[PDB]
Amino acid sequence: TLTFTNLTYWLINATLPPAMKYPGTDTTITRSDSSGYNRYVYVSYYYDPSTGYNVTRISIVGFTGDPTNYTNVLQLCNKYYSGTLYAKLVAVGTVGTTNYESYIKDFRVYFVNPTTTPNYVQFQGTSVTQSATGSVSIGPGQCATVGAYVLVDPSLPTSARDGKTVIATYQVNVVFSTSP
C-alpha cells in the first residue's frame, strides 16, 4: 500500500587514491651486509588480485633483542585531492601464522612529522592492546609521514636470524577522510 520504488541510477568511476604510497628515505640506505637482501626496507605497492586492493608490501627489518624504530617509512600524501585529508589508524590483527609471532614483545606505530593525539596502535604478540588513534590533517603541499617501532625477543633461533625468513605479518587499516 502506497509503495513507490526508487530505481536508482548510481554513477561510479573510481578515481586514483589521492593519498598514494611513497617509499620514503628508508629505502635509500642502499647498503647492507652479506645477508642476501641489498635493502632493509622493501616498500612496494602491488595490485592484489585475490580481493582487489592496492595492498602495499613494505619490509620492516626489526633487529633481534633490540627495540628498533623507524622515522620515514610511509607517506600518506595527497597529490590528486586539492583539500585537506583527515585520517585515523586501526589495526586488524594477524595474517597467516609463521609460528614465530609469540617472539614479538611490542609492535607500535607512531609518526614523526604528523603529531596529534596518541598516534600509535600497539600490538602485543598475537593479541592487540590499542584500538585506534585520532584524526590528523593532511592537505596539499604539506605531506604526512608514517613511522614504526619494532622490538623482537632474542630467543629466536639463529636460523631465523638471517633476515630471509618472515617472522610476522600484520594488517593496518588507515582511514583517510576529508572530515575529522
Task: For residue 78, give the nearest of 147, 27, 137 by alpha carbon.
Answer: 137
Tell the residue number behind the cell numbers 630471509, with chain if given: 164
Nearest approach in angstroms of CB 89 to a copy of itself is 9
Q: According to the binding rule CB under 8 A, does residue 8 interact with a copy of itself?
A: yes
**Looking at beta carbons only, is 48 or 137 nearer to a copy of itself?**
48
Q: Which range, of 27-35, 113-121, 127-135, touches a copy of itself by CB under 8 A?
A: 27-35
Q: According to the binding rule CB under 8 A, does residue 58 interact with a copy of itself?
A: yes
* Cα separation, 95 vs 132, whole angstroms: 19
Q: Which range, of 60-68, 110-118, 128-136, touches a copy of itself by CB under 8 A?
A: 60-68
* Cα separation, 45 vs 50, whole angstroms: 15
Q: Which range, of 32-40, 110-118, 130-138, touches a copy of itself by CB under 8 A?
A: 32-40
Q: How far is CA 65 from CA 62, 78, 166, in A?
A: 9, 37, 16
